[PDB]
Structure formats: C-alpha cells, structure tokens
The first five atom37 places (N, CA, C, CB, O) and aatype in JSON, in Angstrom:
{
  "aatype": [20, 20, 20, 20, 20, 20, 20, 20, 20, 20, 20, 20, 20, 20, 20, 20, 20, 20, 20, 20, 20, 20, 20, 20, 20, 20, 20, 20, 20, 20, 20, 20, 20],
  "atom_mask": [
    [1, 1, 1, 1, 1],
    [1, 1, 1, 1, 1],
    [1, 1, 1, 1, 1],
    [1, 1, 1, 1, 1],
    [1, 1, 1, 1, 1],
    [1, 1, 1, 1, 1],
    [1, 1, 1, 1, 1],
    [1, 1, 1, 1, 1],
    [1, 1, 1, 1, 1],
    [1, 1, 1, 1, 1],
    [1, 1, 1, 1, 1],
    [1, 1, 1, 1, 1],
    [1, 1, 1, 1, 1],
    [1, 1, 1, 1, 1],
    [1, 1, 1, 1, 1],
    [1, 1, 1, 1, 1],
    [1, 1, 1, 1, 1],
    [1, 1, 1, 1, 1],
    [1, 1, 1, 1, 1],
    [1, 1, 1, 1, 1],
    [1, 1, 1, 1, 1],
    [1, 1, 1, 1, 1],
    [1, 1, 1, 1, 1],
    [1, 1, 1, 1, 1],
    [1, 1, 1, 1, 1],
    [1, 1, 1, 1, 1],
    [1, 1, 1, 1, 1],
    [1, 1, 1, 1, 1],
    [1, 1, 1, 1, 1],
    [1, 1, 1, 1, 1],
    [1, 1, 1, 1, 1],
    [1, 1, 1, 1, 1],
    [1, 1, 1, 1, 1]
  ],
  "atom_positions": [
    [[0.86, -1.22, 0.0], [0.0, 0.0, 0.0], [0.88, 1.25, 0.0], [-0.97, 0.02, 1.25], [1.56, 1.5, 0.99]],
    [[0.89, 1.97, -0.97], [1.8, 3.18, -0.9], [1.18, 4.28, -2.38], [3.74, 2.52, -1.07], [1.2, 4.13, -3.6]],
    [[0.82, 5.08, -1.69], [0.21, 6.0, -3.0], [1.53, 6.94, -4.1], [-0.97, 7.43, -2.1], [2.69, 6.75, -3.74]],
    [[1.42, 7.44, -4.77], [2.9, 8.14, -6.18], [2.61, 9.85, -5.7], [2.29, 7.8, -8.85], [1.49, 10.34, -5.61]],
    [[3.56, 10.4, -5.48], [3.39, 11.69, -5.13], [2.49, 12.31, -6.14], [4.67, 12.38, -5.0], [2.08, 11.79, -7.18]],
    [[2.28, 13.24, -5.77], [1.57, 14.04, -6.74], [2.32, 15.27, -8.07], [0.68, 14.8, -5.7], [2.06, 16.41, -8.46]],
    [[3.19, 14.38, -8.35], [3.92, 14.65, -9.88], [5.12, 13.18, -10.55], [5.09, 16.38, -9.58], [6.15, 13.25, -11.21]],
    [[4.54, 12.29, -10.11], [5.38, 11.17, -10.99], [4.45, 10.53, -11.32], [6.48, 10.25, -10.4], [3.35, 10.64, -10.77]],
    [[4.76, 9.53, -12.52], [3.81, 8.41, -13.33], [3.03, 7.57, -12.39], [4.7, 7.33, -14.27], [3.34, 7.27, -11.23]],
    [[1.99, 7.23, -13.04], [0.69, 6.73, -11.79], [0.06, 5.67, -13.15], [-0.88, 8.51, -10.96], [-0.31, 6.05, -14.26]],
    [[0.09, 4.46, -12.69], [-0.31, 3.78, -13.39], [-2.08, 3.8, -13.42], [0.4, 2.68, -13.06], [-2.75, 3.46, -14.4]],
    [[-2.53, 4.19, -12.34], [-3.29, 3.99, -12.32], [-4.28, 5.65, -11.64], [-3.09, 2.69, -11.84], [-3.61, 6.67, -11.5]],
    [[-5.79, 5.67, -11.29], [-6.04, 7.19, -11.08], [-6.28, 7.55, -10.15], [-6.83, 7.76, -11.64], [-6.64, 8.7, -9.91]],
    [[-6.12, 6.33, -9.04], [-6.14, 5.84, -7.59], [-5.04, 5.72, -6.78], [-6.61, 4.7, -7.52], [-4.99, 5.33, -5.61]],
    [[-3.94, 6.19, -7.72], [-2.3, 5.77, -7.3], [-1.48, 6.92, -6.25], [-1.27, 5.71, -8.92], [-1.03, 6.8, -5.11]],
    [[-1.52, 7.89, -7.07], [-0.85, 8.85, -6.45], [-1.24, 9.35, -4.73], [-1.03, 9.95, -7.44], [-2.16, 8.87, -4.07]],
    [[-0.77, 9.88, -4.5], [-1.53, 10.1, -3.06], [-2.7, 11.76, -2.62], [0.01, 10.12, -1.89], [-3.15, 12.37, -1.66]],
    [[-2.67, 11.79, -4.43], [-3.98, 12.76, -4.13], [-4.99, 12.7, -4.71], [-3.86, 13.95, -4.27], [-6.01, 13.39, -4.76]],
    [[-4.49, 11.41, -5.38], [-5.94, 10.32, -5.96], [-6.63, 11.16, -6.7], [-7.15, 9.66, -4.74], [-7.85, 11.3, -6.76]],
    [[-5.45, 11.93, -7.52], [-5.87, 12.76, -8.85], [-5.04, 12.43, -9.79], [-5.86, 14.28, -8.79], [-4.59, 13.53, -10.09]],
    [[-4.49, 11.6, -10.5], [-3.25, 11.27, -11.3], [-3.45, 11.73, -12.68], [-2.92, 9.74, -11.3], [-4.25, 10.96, -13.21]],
    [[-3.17, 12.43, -13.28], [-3.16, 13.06, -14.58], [-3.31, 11.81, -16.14], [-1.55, 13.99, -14.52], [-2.39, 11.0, -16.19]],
    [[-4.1, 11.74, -16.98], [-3.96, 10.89, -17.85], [-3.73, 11.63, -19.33], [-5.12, 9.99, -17.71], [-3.49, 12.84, -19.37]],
    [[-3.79, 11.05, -20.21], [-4.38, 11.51, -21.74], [-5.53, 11.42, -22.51], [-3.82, 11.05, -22.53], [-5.67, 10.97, -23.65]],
    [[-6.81, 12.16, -21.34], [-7.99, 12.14, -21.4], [-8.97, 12.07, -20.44], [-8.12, 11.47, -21.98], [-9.48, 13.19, -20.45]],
    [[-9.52, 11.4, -19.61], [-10.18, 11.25, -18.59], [-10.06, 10.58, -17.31], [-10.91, 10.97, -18.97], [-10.93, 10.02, -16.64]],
    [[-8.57, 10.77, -17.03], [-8.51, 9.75, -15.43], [-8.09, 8.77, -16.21], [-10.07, 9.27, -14.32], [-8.87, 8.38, -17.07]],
    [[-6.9, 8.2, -16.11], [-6.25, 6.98, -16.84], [-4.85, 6.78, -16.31], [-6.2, 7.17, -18.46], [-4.69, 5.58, -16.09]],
    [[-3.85, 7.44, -16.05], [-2.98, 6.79, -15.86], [-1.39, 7.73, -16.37], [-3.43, 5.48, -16.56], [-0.3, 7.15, -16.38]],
    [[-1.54, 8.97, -16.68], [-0.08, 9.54, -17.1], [0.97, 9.63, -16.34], [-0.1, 10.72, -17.47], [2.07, 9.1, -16.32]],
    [[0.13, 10.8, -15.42], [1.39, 11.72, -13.9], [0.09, 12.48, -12.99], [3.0, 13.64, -14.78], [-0.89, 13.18, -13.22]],
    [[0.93, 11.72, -11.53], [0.25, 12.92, -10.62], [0.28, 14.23, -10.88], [0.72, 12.98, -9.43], [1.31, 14.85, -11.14]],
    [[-1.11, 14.81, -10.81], [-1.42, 15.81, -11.25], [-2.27, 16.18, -10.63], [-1.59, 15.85, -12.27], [-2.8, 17.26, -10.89]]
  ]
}
C-alpha cells in the first residue's frame, strides 16, 4: 500500500496520493497531477 506523489507516473487514477493522477484524457494513468 503506498500512494505516487503528486507529480510522478501513476499507473493507475487511484495511485498517487492525491488520488488525482493526470492521464491523456479522462482519469487513466499519465502523472500525478
């Protein structure tokens, strides 16, 4: 269990730890964001 800061790659849109992760389109997976 460990969330991706909120500016590195996030596989997922649940990842980062502000459970906003940036994609290429709608919540997917780019960079915390």
């Amino acid at each position: 269990g460990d969330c991706l800061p909120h500016l590195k790659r996030c596989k997922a849109d649940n990842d980062c730890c502000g459970k906003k992760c940036k994609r290429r389109g709608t919540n997917a997976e780019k960079r915390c964001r």
